[PDB]
């Protein structure tokens, strides 16, 4: 009956940020002290909650969203932020209640020559709504002539491969990110801390 946080944080593979992963966590006892007393995270920021008080809290459901971005984009995973990530890949609402946790994953997610498996959406006409996920790969029309699935002039592939190399500057290295959203509805609480 322990919440499967190891499944999320210690997953062998992480999703690309554009195709971000969501794991519904429910009907379990959650020990957030396992995460909070661990000095393995470069980012651990909470909104609407105190990180120490998490063990004495109950929620209807907890969502754990995970993906990979550069270190310099981790700042975009917070309410009220702008940039290619917050705008076209993963958007937190202004009323966000939850925690954002990150750590450098260069030893797992970068390879000599470049890891072209991690991607981000570079092109999108309008910003994503909060918690919206767009996995479309259709050719992006940057002019008046239709693309018709053909890449070329004013016709872009919307996603860009990060191409993580171990020789990248630390802010350009891959970072694994887990976002915990805490949901509180007029329904029974399925996720409580150790009581």
């Amino acid at each position: 009956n322990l919440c499967p946080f190891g499944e999320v944080f210690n997953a062998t593979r992480f999703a690309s940020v554009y195709a971000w992963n969501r794991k519904r966590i429910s009907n379990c006892v959650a020990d957030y002290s396992v995460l909070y007393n661990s000095a393995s995270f470069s980012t651990f920021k909470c909104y609407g909650v105190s990180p120490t008080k998490l063990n004495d809290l109950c929620f209807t459901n907890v969502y754990a969203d995970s993906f990979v971005i550069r270190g310099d984009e981790v700042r975009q995973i917070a309410p009220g932020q702008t940039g290619k990530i917050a705008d076209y890949n993963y958007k937190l609402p202004d009323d966000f209640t939850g925690c954002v946790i990150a750590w450098n994953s260069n030893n797992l997610d970068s390879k000599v020559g470049g890891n072209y498996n991690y991607l981000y959406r570079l092109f999108r006409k309008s910003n994503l709504k909060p918690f919206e996920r767009d996995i479309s790969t259709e050719i992006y029309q940057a002019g008046s002539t239709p693309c018709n699935g053909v890449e070329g002039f004013n016709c872009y592939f919307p996603l860009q491969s990060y191409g993580f190399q171990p020789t990248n500057g630390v802010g350009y290295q891959p970072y694994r990110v887990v976002v915990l959203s805490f949901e509180l509805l007029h329904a029974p609480a399925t996720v409580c801390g150790p009581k």
């Epitope: 550069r70 310099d72 702008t82 940039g83 290619k84 705008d87 076209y88 470049g114 981000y120 570079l122 092109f123 999108r124 006409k125 309008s126 910003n127 029309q141 940057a142 002019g143 008046s144 004013n154 860009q160 191409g163 190399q165 020789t167 990248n168 500057g169 630390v170 802010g171 350009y172």
Partner: antibody, heavy 120, light 108 residues
């Protein structure tokens, strides 16, 4: 045929305001990342500002709080509102299609440039 | 914070020569780099993007190479119209720093 035609440059006193225009043809301004790059006399190039299709804007530290990038989708035009101008803002200002951060394509099409002289 | 060191500042060459212009980034920037050519009184012109992709319309004698910190621009057989200033540009992060420039001038 891609065209980036600029206007708005001229002589202005320090503390004054100027607005630059860049009418485009051959692509849709509002669908692209669009930048302003400037070149002081006898100097190199310096990126100034960018506007995203979704509306996000970024500025180089030296112009932050004084400049405003904007666009008009109906006129297919890019604008640069330059307030509190300083003598060091003296440069030929170019509009260009593209972005400079996580954007491998670079700035493929540039305008002819428009000289802005800030002097007392 | 990325510093771009372009070398040389000046390059003396003759028509038909093979020329190389170097750009060094202070940290690894993968293939986020572009090369431009600029002539006096004219706007810059994109030659190479994504460190090694030749921009459409640009002559095949122009070629880019490198990934990470060390980038080169090669012009395999110099033509009179190639005597101009060349600039590298990092496309990794704001402010998309340009190199100092390389003036390609005529040997005599």
């Amino acid at each position: 045929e891609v065209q980036l035609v600029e206007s708005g440059g001229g002589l202005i006193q320090p503390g004054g305001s100027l607005r630059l225009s860049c009418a485009a043809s051959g692509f849709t301004v509002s669908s692209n990342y669009m930048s302003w790059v400037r070149q002081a006399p006898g100097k190199g190039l310096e990126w100034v500002s960018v506007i995203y299709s979704g509306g996000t804007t970024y500025y180089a530290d030296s112009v932050k709080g004084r400049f405003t990038i904007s666009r008009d989708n109906s006129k297919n035009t890019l604008y640069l509102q330059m307030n509190s101008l300083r003598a060091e803002d003296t440069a030929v200002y170019y509009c260009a299609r593209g972005d400079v951060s996580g954007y491998r394509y670079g700035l493929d099409y540039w305008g002819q440039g428009t000289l802005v002289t800030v002097s007392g | 914070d990325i510093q771009l060191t372009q070398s040389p500042s000046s390059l003396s060459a003759s028509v038909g020569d093979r020329v190389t212009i170097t750009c060094r980034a202070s940290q690894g920037i993968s293939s986020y780099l572009a090369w431009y050519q600029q002539k006096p009184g004219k706007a810059p012109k994109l030659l190479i993007y994504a460190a090694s992709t030749l921009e459409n319309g640009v002559p095949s004698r122009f070629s880019g190479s490198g990934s990470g910190t060390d980038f080169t621009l090669t012009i395999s057989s110099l033509q009179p119209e190639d005597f101009a200033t060349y600039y590298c540009q990092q496309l990794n992060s704001y402010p998309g720093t340009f190199g100092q420039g390389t003036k390609l001038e005529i040997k005599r």
